[PDB]
PDB file of all heavy atoms in Angstrom:
ATOM      1  N   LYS S 364     -24.784 -55.192  -2.186  1.00  0.00           N
ATOM      2  CA  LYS S 364     -23.838 -54.721  -3.151  1.00  0.00           C
ATOM      3  C   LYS S 364     -23.755 -53.239  -3.037  1.00  0.00           C
ATOM      4  O   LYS S 364     -24.745 -52.556  -2.793  1.00  0.00           O
ATOM      5  CB  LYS S 364     -24.220 -55.056  -4.603  1.00  0.00           C
ATOM      6  CG  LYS S 364     -25.532 -54.407  -5.052  1.00  0.00           C
ATOM      7  CD  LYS S 364     -26.742 -54.840  -4.225  1.00  0.00           C
ATOM      8  CE  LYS S 364     -28.053 -54.191  -4.673  1.00  0.00           C
ATOM      9  NZ  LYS S 364     -29.170 -54.663  -3.822  1.00  0.00           N
ATOM     10  N   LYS S 365     -22.526 -52.726  -3.191  1.00  0.00           N
ATOM     11  CA  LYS S 365     -22.203 -51.335  -3.186  1.00  0.00           C
ATOM     12  C   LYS S 365     -22.278 -50.881  -4.596  1.00  0.00           C
ATOM     13  O   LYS S 365     -22.486 -51.699  -5.485  1.00  0.00           O
ATOM     14  CB  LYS S 365     -20.767 -51.099  -2.711  1.00  0.00           C
ATOM     15  CG  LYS S 365     -19.883 -52.298  -3.062  1.00  0.00           C
ATOM     16  CD  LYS S 365     -19.983 -52.732  -4.526  1.00  0.00           C
ATOM     17  CE  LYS S 365     -18.785 -52.360  -5.393  1.00  0.00           C
ATOM     18  NZ  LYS S 365     -19.020 -52.829  -6.777  1.00  0.00           N
ATOM     19  N   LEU S 366     -22.165 -49.561  -4.844  1.00  0.00           N
ATOM     20  CA  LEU S 366     -22.099 -49.169  -6.219  1.00  0.00           C
ATOM     21  C   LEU S 366     -23.442 -49.372  -6.849  1.00  0.00           C
ATOM     22  O   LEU S 366     -24.370 -49.749  -6.136  1.00  0.00           O
ATOM     23  CB  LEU S 366     -20.975 -49.935  -6.947  1.00  0.00           C
ATOM     24  CG  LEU S 366     -19.567 -49.440  -6.556  1.00  0.00           C
ATOM     25  CD1 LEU S 366     -19.298 -48.037  -7.126  1.00  0.00           C
ATOM     26  CD2 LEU S 366     -19.347 -49.490  -5.036  1.00  0.00           C
ATOM     27  N   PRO S 367     -23.651 -49.133  -8.128  1.00  0.00           N
ATOM     28  CA  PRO S 367     -22.636 -48.698  -9.061  1.00  0.00           C
ATOM     29  C   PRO S 367     -22.217 -47.269  -8.920  1.00  0.00           C
ATOM     30  O   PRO S 367     -22.890 -46.506  -8.229  1.00  0.00           O
ATOM     31  CB  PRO S 367     -23.163 -49.027 -10.454  1.00  0.00           C
ATOM     32  CG  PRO S 367     -24.142 -50.186 -10.216  1.00  0.00           C
ATOM     33  CD  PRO S 367     -24.662 -49.944  -8.793  1.00  0.00           C
ATOM     34  N   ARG S 368     -21.092 -46.900  -9.578  1.00  0.00           N
ATOM     35  CA  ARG S 368     -20.549 -45.575  -9.486  1.00  0.00           C
ATOM     36  C   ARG S 368     -21.479 -44.598 -10.122  1.00  0.00           C
ATOM     37  O   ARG S 368     -21.721 -44.619 -11.327  1.00  0.00           O
ATOM     38  CB  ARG S 368     -19.175 -45.427 -10.165  1.00  0.00           C
ATOM     39  CG  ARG S 368     -19.193 -45.763 -11.657  1.00  0.00           C
ATOM     40  CD  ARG S 368     -19.149 -47.265 -11.945  1.00  0.00           C
ATOM     41  NE  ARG S 368     -19.173 -47.443 -13.424  1.00  0.00           N
ATOM     42  CZ  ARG S 368     -18.007 -47.398 -14.134  1.00  0.00           C
ATOM     43  NH1 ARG S 368     -16.823 -47.187 -13.490  1.00  0.00           N
ATOM     44  NH2 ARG S 368     -18.026 -47.565 -15.489  1.00  0.00           N
ATOM     45  N   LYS S 369     -22.014 -43.703  -9.273  1.00  0.00           N
ATOM     46  CA  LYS S 369     -22.908 -42.632  -9.602  1.00  0.00           C
ATOM     47  C   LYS S 369     -23.152 -42.125  -8.246  1.00  0.00           C
ATOM     48  O   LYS S 369     -22.704 -41.050  -7.851  1.00  0.00           O
ATOM     49  CB  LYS S 369     -24.322 -43.038 -10.053  1.00  0.00           C
ATOM     50  CG  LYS S 369     -24.407 -44.076 -11.163  1.00  0.00           C
ATOM     51  CD  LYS S 369     -24.232 -45.502 -10.646  1.00  0.00           C
ATOM     52  CE  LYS S 369     -24.337 -46.554 -11.746  1.00  0.00           C
ATOM     53  NZ  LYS S 369     -23.017 -46.744 -12.381  1.00  0.00           N
ATOM     54  N   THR S 370     -23.915 -42.950  -7.510  1.00  0.00           N
ATOM     55  CA  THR S 370     -24.120 -42.717  -6.129  1.00  0.00           C
ATOM     56  C   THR S 370     -23.071 -43.535  -5.464  1.00  0.00           C
ATOM     57  O   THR S 370     -23.216 -43.972  -4.323  1.00  0.00           O
ATOM     58  CB  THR S 370     -25.457 -43.190  -5.644  1.00  0.00           C
ATOM     59  OG1 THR S 370     -25.637 -42.849  -4.276  1.00  0.00           O
ATOM     60  CG2 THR S 370     -25.541 -44.714  -5.837  1.00  0.00           C
ATOM     61  N   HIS S 371     -21.963 -43.742  -6.199  1.00  0.00           N
ATOM     62  CA  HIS S 371     -20.855 -44.495  -5.703  1.00  0.00           C
ATOM     63  C   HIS S 371     -20.254 -43.711  -4.590  1.00  0.00           C
ATOM     64  O   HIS S 371     -19.898 -44.255  -3.546  1.00  0.00           O
ATOM     65  CB  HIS S 371     -19.759 -44.721  -6.762  1.00  0.00           C
ATOM     66  CG  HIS S 371     -19.143 -43.445  -7.259  1.00  0.00           C
ATOM     67  ND1 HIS S 371     -17.951 -43.713  -7.941  1.00  0.00           N
ATOM     68  CD2 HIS S 371     -18.086 -42.940  -7.937  1.00  0.00           C
ATOM     69  CE1 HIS S 371     -18.790 -42.760  -7.538  1.00  0.00           C
ATOM     70  NE2 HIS S 371     -18.664 -44.093  -7.478  1.00  0.00           N
ATOM     71  N   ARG S 372     -20.151 -42.386  -4.790  1.00  0.00           N
ATOM     72  CA  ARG S 372     -19.555 -41.538  -3.813  1.00  0.00           C
ATOM     73  C   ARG S 372     -20.378 -41.643  -2.578  1.00  0.00           C
ATOM     74  O   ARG S 372     -19.841 -41.753  -1.478  1.00  0.00           O
ATOM     75  CB  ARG S 372     -19.536 -40.053  -4.218  1.00  0.00           C
ATOM     76  CG  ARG S 372     -20.931 -39.452  -4.377  1.00  0.00           C
ATOM     77  CD  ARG S 372     -21.783 -40.168  -5.422  1.00  0.00           C
ATOM     78  NE  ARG S 372     -23.103 -39.484  -5.471  1.00  0.00           N
ATOM     79  CZ  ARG S 372     -23.273 -38.408  -6.290  1.00  0.00           C
ATOM     80  NH1 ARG S 372     -22.234 -37.967  -7.058  1.00  0.00           N
ATOM     81  NH2 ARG S 372     -24.480 -37.776  -6.342  1.00  0.00           N
ATOM     82  N   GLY S 373     -21.715 -41.654  -2.728  1.00  0.00           N
ATOM     83  CA  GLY S 373     -22.563 -41.699  -1.574  1.00  0.00           C
ATOM     84  C   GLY S 373     -22.469 -43.074  -0.990  1.00  0.00           C
ATOM     85  O   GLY S 373     -21.788 -43.948  -1.530  1.00  0.00           O
ATOM     86  N   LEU S 374     -23.163 -43.296   0.145  1.00  0.00           N
ATOM     87  CA  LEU S 374     -23.124 -44.552   0.840  1.00  0.00           C
ATOM     88  C   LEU S 374     -23.863 -45.564   0.026  1.00  0.00           C
ATOM     89  O   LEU S 374     -24.681 -45.216  -0.823  1.00  0.00           O
ATOM     90  CB  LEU S 374     -23.776 -44.506   2.233  1.00  0.00           C
ATOM     91  CG  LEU S 374     -23.060 -43.565   3.219  1.00  0.00           C
ATOM     92  CD1 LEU S 374     -21.636 -44.057   3.528  1.00  0.00           C
ATOM     93  CD2 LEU S 374     -23.093 -42.110   2.724  1.00  0.00           C
ATOM     94  N   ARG S 375     -23.569 -46.863   0.258  1.00  0.00           N
ATOM     95  CA  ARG S 375     -24.209 -47.883  -0.512  1.00  0.00           C
ATOM     96  C   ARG S 375     -25.666 -47.821  -0.228  1.00  0.00           C
ATOM     97  O   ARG S 375     -26.089 -47.890   0.922  1.00  0.00           O
ATOM     98  CB  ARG S 375     -23.726 -49.294  -0.163  1.00  0.00           C
ATOM     99  CG  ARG S 375     -24.214 -50.408  -1.096  1.00  0.00           C
ATOM    100  CD  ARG S 375     -25.726 -50.644  -1.087  1.00  0.00           C
ATOM    101  NE  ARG S 375     -26.225 -50.367  -2.464  1.00  0.00           N
ATOM    102  CZ  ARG S 375     -27.124 -51.217  -3.044  1.00  0.00           C
ATOM    103  NH1 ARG S 375     -27.597 -52.288  -2.343  1.00  0.00           N
ATOM    104  NH2 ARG S 375     -27.534 -51.012  -4.331  1.00  0.00           N
ATOM    105  N   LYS S 376     -26.479 -47.685  -1.289  1.00  0.00           N
ATOM    106  CA  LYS S 376     -27.894 -47.628  -1.106  1.00  0.00           C
ATOM    107  C   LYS S 376     -28.486 -48.670  -1.987  1.00  0.00           C
ATOM    108  O   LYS S 376     -28.221 -48.709  -3.187  1.00  0.00           O
ATOM    109  CB  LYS S 376     -28.510 -46.280  -1.511  1.00  0.00           C
ATOM    110  CG  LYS S 376     -28.277 -45.912  -2.980  1.00  0.00           C
ATOM    111  CD  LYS S 376     -26.799 -45.781  -3.357  1.00  0.00           C
ATOM    112  CE  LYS S 376     -26.218 -47.031  -4.025  1.00  0.00           C
ATOM    113  NZ  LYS S 376     -24.743 -46.922  -4.118  1.00  0.00           N
ATOM    114  N   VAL S 377     -29.322 -49.538  -1.397  1.00  0.00           N
ATOM    115  CA  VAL S 377     -29.931 -50.603  -2.132  1.00  0.00           C
ATOM    116  C   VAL S 377     -30.978 -49.991  -2.991  1.00  0.00           C
ATOM    117  O   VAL S 377     -31.433 -48.879  -2.737  1.00  0.00           O
ATOM    118  CB  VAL S 377     -30.589 -51.619  -1.236  1.00  0.00           C
ATOM    119  CG1 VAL S 377     -31.229 -52.727  -2.094  1.00  0.00           C
ATOM    120  CG2 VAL S 377     -29.541 -52.135  -0.237  1.00  0.00           C
ATOM    121  N   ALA S 378     -31.370 -50.708  -4.061  1.00  0.00           N
ATOM    122  CA  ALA S 378     -32.403 -50.222  -4.919  1.00  0.00           C
ATOM    123  C   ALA S 378     -33.611 -50.084  -4.051  1.00  0.00           C
ATOM    124  O   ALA S 378     -33.640 -50.596  -2.933  1.00  0.00           O
ATOM    125  CB  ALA S 378     -32.753 -51.179  -6.072  1.00  0.00           C
ATOM    126  N   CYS S 379     -34.637 -49.368  -4.551  1.00  0.00           N
ATOM    127  CA  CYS S 379     -35.802 -49.071  -3.766  1.00  0.00           C
ATOM    128  C   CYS S 379     -36.342 -50.332  -3.185  1.00  0.00           C
ATOM    129  O   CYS S 379     -36.280 -51.398  -3.797  1.00  0.00           O
ATOM    130  CB  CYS S 379     -36.931 -48.399  -4.565  1.00  0.00           C
ATOM    131  SG  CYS S 379     -37.594 -49.476  -5.871  1.00  0.00           S
ATOM    132  N   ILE S 380     -36.872 -50.230  -1.948  1.00  0.00           N
ATOM    133  CA  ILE S 380     -37.313 -51.402  -1.260  1.00  0.00           C
ATOM    134  C   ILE S 380     -38.785 -51.545  -1.387  1.00  0.00           C
ATOM    135  O   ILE S 380     -39.556 -50.891  -0.687  1.00  0.00           O
ATOM    136  CB  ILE S 380     -37.012 -51.363   0.209  1.00  0.00           C
ATOM    137  CG1 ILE S 380     -35.496 -51.363   0.454  1.00  0.00           C
ATOM    138  CG2 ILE S 380     -37.764 -52.526   0.877  1.00  0.00           C
ATOM    139  CD1 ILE S 380     -35.109 -51.033   1.894  1.00  0.00           C
ATOM    140  N   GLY S 381     -39.204 -52.416  -2.319  1.00  0.00           N
ATOM    141  CA  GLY S 381     -40.587 -52.732  -2.479  1.00  0.00           C
ATOM    142  C   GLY S 381     -41.234 -51.561  -3.118  1.00  0.00           C
ATOM    143  O   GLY S 381     -40.966 -50.419  -2.750  1.00  0.00           O
ATOM    144  N   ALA S 382     -42.111 -51.818  -4.106  1.00  0.00           N
ATOM    145  CA  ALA S 382     -42.841 -50.732  -4.674  1.00  0.00           C
ATOM    146  C   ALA S 382     -44.109 -51.294  -5.182  1.00  0.00           C
ATOM    147  O   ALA S 382     -44.121 -52.212  -6.001  1.00  0.00           O
ATOM    148  CB  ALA S 382     -42.130 -50.068  -5.866  1.00  0.00           C
ATOM    149  N   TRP S 383     -45.217 -50.724  -4.698  1.00  0.00           N
ATOM    150  CA  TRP S 383     -46.518 -51.175  -5.049  1.00  0.00           C
ATOM    151  C   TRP S 383     -47.502 -50.597  -4.103  1.00  0.00           C
ATOM    152  O   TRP S 383     -47.427 -49.418  -3.762  1.00  0.00           O
ATOM    153  CB  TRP S 383     -46.703 -52.702  -5.149  1.00  0.00           C
ATOM    154  CG  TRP S 383     -45.796 -53.538  -4.285  1.00  0.00           C
ATOM    155  CD1 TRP S 383     -44.906 -54.488  -4.685  1.00  0.00           C
ATOM    156  CD2 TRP S 383     -45.628 -53.396  -2.871  1.00  0.00           C
ATOM    157  NE1 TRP S 383     -44.212 -54.968  -3.605  1.00  0.00           N
ATOM    158  CE2 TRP S 383     -44.640 -54.300  -2.481  1.00  0.00           C
ATOM    159  CE3 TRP S 383     -46.228 -52.570  -1.972  1.00  0.00           C
ATOM    160  CZ2 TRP S 383     -44.240 -54.390  -1.181  1.00  0.00           C
ATOM    161  CZ3 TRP S 383     -45.835 -52.684  -0.660  1.00  0.00           C
ATOM    162  CH2 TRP S 383     -44.862 -53.573  -0.268  1.00  0.00           C
ATOM    163  N   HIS S 384     -48.493 -51.427  -3.712  1.00  0.00           N
ATOM    164  CA  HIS S 384     -49.567 -50.972  -2.888  1.00  0.00           C
ATOM    165  C   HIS S 384     -49.150 -50.541  -1.525  1.00  0.00           C
ATOM    166  O   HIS S 384     -49.458 -49.403  -1.175  1.00  0.00           O
ATOM    167  CB  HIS S 384     -50.713 -51.999  -2.772  1.00  0.00           C
ATOM    168  CG  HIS S 384     -51.894 -51.467  -2.018  1.00  0.00           C
ATOM    169  ND1 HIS S 384     -51.991 -51.463  -0.644  1.00  0.00           N
ATOM    170  CD2 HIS S 384     -53.047 -50.908  -2.474  1.00  0.00           C
ATOM    171  CE1 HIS S 384     -53.190 -50.908  -0.340  1.00  0.00           C
ATOM    172  NE2 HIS S 384     -53.868 -50.554  -1.417  1.00  0.00           N
ATOM    173  N   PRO S 385     -48.489 -51.322  -0.704  1.00  0.00           N
ATOM    174  CA  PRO S 385     -48.182 -50.710   0.542  1.00  0.00           C
ATOM    175  C   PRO S 385     -47.148 -49.693   0.256  1.00  0.00           C
ATOM    176  O   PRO S 385     -46.204 -49.988  -0.470  1.00  0.00           O
ATOM    177  CB  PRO S 385     -47.794 -51.832   1.494  1.00  0.00           C
ATOM    178  CG  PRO S 385     -48.654 -53.003   0.993  1.00  0.00           C
ATOM    179  CD  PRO S 385     -48.860 -52.718  -0.507  1.00  0.00           C
ATOM    180  N   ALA S 386     -47.314 -48.466   0.758  1.00  0.00           N
ATOM    181  CA  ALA S 386     -46.294 -47.531   0.430  1.00  0.00           C
ATOM    182  C   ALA S 386     -45.041 -47.973   1.117  1.00  0.00           C
ATOM    183  O   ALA S 386     -43.960 -47.985   0.527  1.00  0.00           O
ATOM    184  CB  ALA S 386     -46.611 -46.107   0.917  1.00  0.00           C
ATOM    185  N   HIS S 387     -45.175 -48.377   2.397  1.00  0.00           N
ATOM    186  CA  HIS S 387     -44.054 -48.766   3.200  1.00  0.00           C
ATOM    187  C   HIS S 387     -43.705 -50.181   2.906  1.00  0.00           C
ATOM    188  O   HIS S 387     -44.526 -50.943   2.400  1.00  0.00           O
ATOM    189  CB  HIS S 387     -44.314 -48.659   4.714  1.00  0.00           C
ATOM    190  CG  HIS S 387     -45.421 -49.558   5.180  1.00  0.00           C
ATOM    191  ND1 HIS S 387     -45.251 -50.881   5.520  1.00  0.00           N
ATOM    192  CD2 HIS S 387     -46.744 -49.295   5.362  1.00  0.00           C
ATOM    193  CE1 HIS S 387     -46.471 -51.353   5.886  1.00  0.00           C
ATOM    194  NE2 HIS S 387     -47.409 -50.424   5.806  1.00  0.00           N
ATOM    195  N   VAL S 388     -42.445 -50.564   3.200  1.00  0.00           N
ATOM    196  CA  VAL S 388     -42.084 -51.917   2.930  1.00  0.00           C
ATOM    197  C   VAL S 388     -41.772 -52.575   4.222  1.00  0.00           C
ATOM    198  O   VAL S 388     -41.034 -52.029   5.035  1.00  0.00           O
ATOM    199  CB  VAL S 388     -40.886 -52.034   2.041  1.00  0.00           C
ATOM    200  CG1 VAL S 388     -39.722 -51.278   2.698  1.00  0.00           C
ATOM    201  CG2 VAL S 388     -40.609 -53.525   1.795  1.00  0.00           C
ATOM    202  N   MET S 389     -42.390 -53.742   4.470  1.00  0.00           N
ATOM    203  CA  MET S 389     -42.035 -54.477   5.645  1.00  0.00           C
ATOM    204  C   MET S 389     -40.652 -54.898   5.407  1.00  0.00           C
ATOM    205  O   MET S 389     -39.795 -54.909   6.289  1.00  0.00           O
ATOM    206  CB  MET S 389     -42.898 -55.737   5.842  1.00  0.00           C
ATOM    207  CG  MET S 389     -42.615 -56.495   7.143  1.00  0.00           C
ATOM    208  SD  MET S 389     -41.019 -57.363   7.202  1.00  0.00           S
ATOM    209  CE  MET S 389     -41.527 -58.700   6.084  1.00  0.00           C
ATOM    210  N   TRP S 390     -40.493 -55.317   4.152  1.00  0.00           N
ATOM    211  CA  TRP S 390     -39.324 -55.637   3.425  1.00  0.00           C
ATOM    212  C   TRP S 390     -38.716 -56.930   3.702  1.00  0.00           C
ATOM    213  O   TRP S 390     -38.666 -57.791   2.827  1.00  0.00           O
ATOM    214  CB  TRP S 390     -38.225 -54.532   3.437  1.00  0.00           C
ATOM    215  CG  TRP S 390     -37.909 -53.749   4.707  1.00  0.00           C
ATOM    216  CD1 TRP S 390     -38.337 -52.487   5.000  1.00  0.00           C
ATOM    217  CD2 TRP S 390     -37.121 -54.164   5.844  1.00  0.00           C
ATOM    218  NE1 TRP S 390     -37.871 -52.089   6.227  1.00  0.00           N
ATOM    219  CE2 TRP S 390     -37.120 -53.110   6.759  1.00  0.00           C
ATOM    220  CE3 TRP S 390     -36.447 -55.320   6.116  1.00  0.00           C
ATOM    221  CZ2 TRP S 390     -36.451 -53.200   7.948  1.00  0.00           C
ATOM    222  CZ3 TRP S 390     -35.775 -55.410   7.313  1.00  0.00           C
ATOM    223  CH2 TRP S 390     -35.777 -54.370   8.216  1.00  0.00           C
ATOM    224  N   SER S 391     -38.266 -57.126   4.942  1.00  0.00           N
ATOM    225  CA  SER S 391     -37.390 -58.235   5.096  1.00  0.00           C
ATOM    226  C   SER S 391     -36.261 -58.015   4.115  1.00  0.00           C
ATOM    227  O   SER S 391     -35.619 -58.972   3.687  1.00  0.00           O
ATOM    228  CB  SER S 391     -38.053 -59.592   4.800  1.00  0.00           C
ATOM    229  OG  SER S 391     -37.114 -60.642   4.978  1.00  0.00           O
ATOM    230  N   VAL S 392     -35.978 -56.739   3.737  1.00  0.00           N
ATOM    231  CA  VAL S 392     -35.001 -56.504   2.741  1.00  0.00           C
ATOM    232  C   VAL S 392     -34.165 -55.312   3.056  1.00  0.00           C
ATOM    233  O   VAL S 392     -34.643 -54.182   3.123  1.00  0.00           O
ATOM    234  CB  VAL S 392     -35.523 -56.367   1.339  1.00  0.00           C
ATOM    235  CG1 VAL S 392     -36.243 -57.674   0.969  1.00  0.00           C
ATOM    236  CG2 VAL S 392     -36.385 -55.107   1.217  1.00  0.00           C
ATOM    237  N   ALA S 393     -32.868 -55.592   3.282  1.00  0.00           N
ATOM    238  CA  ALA S 393     -31.793 -54.654   3.372  1.00  0.00           C
ATOM    239  C   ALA S 393     -32.160 -53.316   3.935  1.00  0.00           C
ATOM    240  O   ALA S 393     -32.568 -52.427   3.189  1.00  0.00           O
ATOM    241  CB  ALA S 393     -31.122 -54.416   2.005  1.00  0.00           C
ATOM    242  N   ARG S 394     -32.044 -53.120   5.264  1.00  0.00           N
ATOM    243  CA  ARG S 394     -32.287 -51.799   5.769  1.00  0.00           C
ATOM    244  C   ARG S 394     -31.207 -51.429   6.736  1.00  0.00           C
ATOM    245  O   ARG S 394     -30.622 -52.286   7.394  1.00  0.00           O
ATOM    246  CB  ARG S 394     -33.622 -51.668   6.523  1.00  0.00           C
ATOM    247  CG  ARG S 394     -33.888 -50.260   7.057  1.00  0.00           C
ATOM    248  CD  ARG S 394     -35.196 -50.140   7.841  1.00  0.00           C
ATOM    249  NE  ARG S 394     -35.320 -48.727   8.295  1.00  0.00           N
ATOM    250  CZ  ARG S 394     -35.901 -47.797   7.483  1.00  0.00           C
ATOM    251  NH1 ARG S 394     -36.379 -48.167   6.258  1.00  0.00           N
ATOM    252  NH2 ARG S 394     -36.005 -46.498   7.891  1.00  0.00           N
ATOM    253  N   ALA S 395     -30.913 -50.116   6.834  1.00  0.00           N
ATOM    254  CA  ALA S 395     -29.914 -49.643   7.750  1.00  0.00           C
ATOM    255  C   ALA S 395     -30.477 -49.802   9.123  1.00  0.00           C
ATOM    256  O   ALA S 395     -31.692 -49.752   9.313  1.00  0.00           O
ATOM    257  CB  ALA S 395     -29.552 -48.160   7.560  1.00  0.00           C
ATOM    258  N   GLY S 396     -29.600 -50.021  10.122  1.00  0.00           N
ATOM    259  CA  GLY S 396     -30.093 -50.175  11.452  1.00  0.00           C
ATOM    260  C   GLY S 396     -28.936 -50.536  12.312  1.00  0.00           C
ATOM    261  O   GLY S 396     -27.785 -50.474  11.886  1.00  0.00           O
ATOM    262  N   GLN S 397     -29.219 -50.934  13.559  1.00  0.00           N
ATOM    263  CA  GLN S 397     -28.190 -51.287  14.470  1.00  0.00           C
ATOM    264  C   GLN S 397     -27.614 -52.554  13.967  1.00  0.00           C
ATOM    265  O   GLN S 397     -28.260 -53.313  13.248  1.00  0.00           O
ATOM    266  CB  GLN S 397     -28.690 -51.582  15.893  1.00  0.00           C
ATOM    267  CG  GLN S 397     -29.465 -52.897  16.008  1.00  0.00           C
ATOM    268  CD  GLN S 397     -30.602 -52.906  14.998  1.00  0.00           C
ATOM    269  OE1 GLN S 397     -30.621 -53.726  14.084  1.00  0.00           O
ATOM    270  NE2 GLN S 397     -31.555 -51.947  15.144  1.00  0.00           N
ATOM    271  N   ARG S 398     -26.338 -52.767  14.304  1.00  0.00           N
ATOM    272  CA  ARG S 398     -25.637 -53.972  14.009  1.00  0.00           C
ATOM    273  C   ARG S 398     -24.829 -54.179  15.239  1.00  0.00           C
ATOM    274  O   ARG S 398     -25.170 -53.652  16.296  1.00  0.00           O
ATOM    275  CB  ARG S 398     -24.670 -53.892  12.831  1.00  0.00           C
ATOM    276  CG  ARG S 398     -23.619 -52.805  12.993  1.00  0.00           C
ATOM    277  CD  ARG S 398     -23.508 -51.964  11.731  1.00  0.00           C
ATOM    278  NE  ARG S 398     -24.900 -51.621  11.321  1.00  0.00           N
ATOM    279  CZ  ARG S 398     -25.569 -52.420  10.441  1.00  0.00           C
ATOM    280  NH1 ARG S 398     -24.984 -53.571  10.004  1.00  0.00           N
ATOM    281  NH2 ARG S 398     -26.814 -52.079   9.999  1.00  0.00           N
ATOM    282  N   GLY S 399     -23.736 -54.956  15.161  1.00  0.00           N
ATOM    283  CA  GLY S 399     -23.044 -55.173  16.379  1.00  0.00           C
ATOM    284  C   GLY S 399     -23.996 -56.021  17.036  1.00  0.00           C
ATOM    285  O   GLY S 399     -24.632 -56.716  16.251  1.00  0.00           O
ATOM    286  N   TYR S 400     -24.121 -55.884  18.394  1.00  0.00           N
ATOM    287  CA  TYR S 400     -24.974 -56.412  19.446  1.00  0.00           C
ATOM    288  C   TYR S 400     -25.588 -57.703  19.044  1.00  0.00           C
ATOM    289  O   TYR S 400     -25.717 -58.087  17.893  1.00  0.00           O
ATOM    290  CB  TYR S 400     -26.204 -55.501  19.778  1.00  0.00           C
ATOM    291  CG  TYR S 400     -27.141 -55.937  18.710  1.00  0.00           C
ATOM    292  CD1 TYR S 400     -28.277 -56.685  18.946  1.00  0.00           C
ATOM    293  CD2 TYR S 400     -26.831 -55.583  17.429  1.00  0.00           C
ATOM    294  CE1 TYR S 400     -29.013 -57.106  17.872  1.00  0.00           C
ATOM    295  CE2 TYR S 400     -27.559 -55.993  16.358  1.00  0.00           C
ATOM    296  CZ  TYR S 400     -28.644 -56.773  16.592  1.00  0.00           C
ATOM    297  OH  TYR S 400     -29.403 -57.213  15.499  1.00  0.00           O
ATOM    298  N   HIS S 401     -26.083 -58.484  19.974  1.00  0.00           N
ATOM    299  CA  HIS S 401     -26.608 -59.551  19.248  1.00  0.00           C
ATOM    300  C   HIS S 401     -27.462 -60.211  20.200  1.00  0.00           C
ATOM    301  O   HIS S 401     -28.334 -59.586  20.791  1.00  0.00           O
ATOM    302  CB  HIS S 401     -25.537 -60.588  18.941  1.00  0.00           C
ATOM    303  CG  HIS S 401     -25.864 -61.161  17.634  1.00  0.00           C
ATOM    304  ND1 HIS S 401     -25.441 -60.579  16.467  1.00  0.00           N
ATOM    305  CD2 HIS S 401     -26.639 -62.212  17.286  1.00  0.00           C
ATOM    306  CE1 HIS S 401     -25.984 -61.300  15.463  1.00  0.00           C
ATOM    307  NE2 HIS S 401     -26.720 -62.301  15.911  1.00  0.00           N
ATOM    308  N   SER S 402     -27.191 -61.521  20.279  1.00  0.00           N
ATOM    309  CA  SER S 402     -27.685 -62.491  21.184  1.00  0.00           C
ATOM    310  C   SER S 402     -27.889 -63.696  20.355  1.00  0.00           C
ATOM    311  O   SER S 402     -28.970 -63.908  19.806  1.00  0.00           O
ATOM    312  CB  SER S 402     -29.033 -62.135  21.842  1.00  0.00           C
ATOM    313  OG  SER S 402     -28.850 -61.107  22.806  1.00  0.00           O
ATOM    314  N   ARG S 403     -26.848 -64.529  20.231  1.00  0.00           N
ATOM    315  CA  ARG S 403     -27.095 -65.675  19.450  1.00  0.00           C
ATOM    316  C   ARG S 403     -26.223 -66.729  19.953  1.00  0.00           C
ATOM    317  O   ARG S 403     -25.135 -66.460  20.455  1.00  0.00           O
ATOM    318  CB  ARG S 403     -26.934 -65.506  17.928  1.00  0.00           C
ATOM    319  CG  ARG S 403     -25.511 -65.267  17.457  1.00  0.00           C
ATOM    320  CD  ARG S 403     -24.625 -64.608  18.502  1.00  0.00           C
ATOM    321  NE  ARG S 403     -23.248 -64.851  18.029  1.00  0.00           N
ATOM    322  CZ  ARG S 403     -22.795 -66.135  18.010  1.00  0.00           C
ATOM    323  NH1 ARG S 403     -23.591 -67.165  18.415  1.00  0.00           N
ATOM    324  NH2 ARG S 403     -21.552 -66.401  17.532  1.00  0.00           N
ATOM    325  N   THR S 404     -26.720 -67.961  19.857  1.00  0.00           N
ATOM    326  CA  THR S 404     -25.995 -69.053  20.368  1.00  0.00           C
ATOM    327  C   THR S 404     -25.169 -69.562  19.259  1.00  0.00           C
ATOM    328  O   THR S 404     -25.323 -69.160  18.111  1.00  0.00           O
ATOM    329  CB  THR S 404     -26.879 -70.168  20.805  1.00  0.00           C
ATOM    330  OG1 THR S 404     -26.099 -71.190  21.406  1.00  0.00           O
ATOM    331  CG2 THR S 404     -27.633 -70.701  19.579  1.00  0.00           C
ATOM    332  N   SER S 405     -24.227 -70.442  19.609  1.00  0.00           N
ATOM    333  CA  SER S 405     -23.466 -71.131  18.629  1.00  0.00           C
ATOM    334  C   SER S 405     -23.779 -72.538  18.979  1.00  0.00           C
ATOM    335  O   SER S 405     -24.216 -72.811  20.095  1.00  0.00           O
ATOM    336  CB  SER S 405     -21.947 -70.957  18.761  1.00  0.00           C
ATOM    337  OG  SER S 405     -21.604 -69.582  18.662  1.00  0.00           O
ATOM    338  N   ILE S 406     -23.592 -73.481  18.047  1.00  0.00           N
ATOM    339  CA  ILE S 406     -23.993 -74.800  18.411  1.00  0.00           C
ATOM    340  C   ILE S 406     -22.795 -75.682  18.372  1.00  0.00           C
ATOM    341  O   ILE S 406     -21.877 -75.496  17.574  1.00  0.00           O
ATOM    342  CB  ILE S 406     -24.988 -75.394  17.455  1.00  0.00           C
ATOM    343  CG1 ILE S 406     -26.274 -74.555  17.417  1.00  0.00           C
ATOM    344  CG2 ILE S 406     -25.220 -76.861  17.847  1.00  0.00           C
ATOM    345  CD1 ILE S 406     -27.194 -74.917  16.253  1.00  0.00           C
TER     346      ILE S 406
END
């Protein structure tokens, strides 16, 4: 989800990713990165 309007002007930023003991988040949750490219079959 994009928004809400505040940092609306800025790029869509997901709420903080994971917060607790590991400082870093493995996440499996919404991160910027390469897209496009792939390698996937269709069935």
Side-chain angles (χ1 to χ4, degrees):
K364 62 299 180 180
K365 29 51 105 180
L366 287 290
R368 59 280 180 86
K369 309 81 179 86
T370 184
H371 62 165
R372 63 301 180 87
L374 296 295
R375 189 295 118 136
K376 60 299 98 191
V377 180
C379 64
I380 295 168
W383 28 239
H384 186 277
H387 62 85
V388 57
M389 184 289 286
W390 41 259
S391 180
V392 300
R394 180 182 180 87
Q397 71 306 116
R398 57 228 47 268
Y400 83 109
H401 213 86
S402 287
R403 68 333 163 294
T404 185
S405 301
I406 299 167

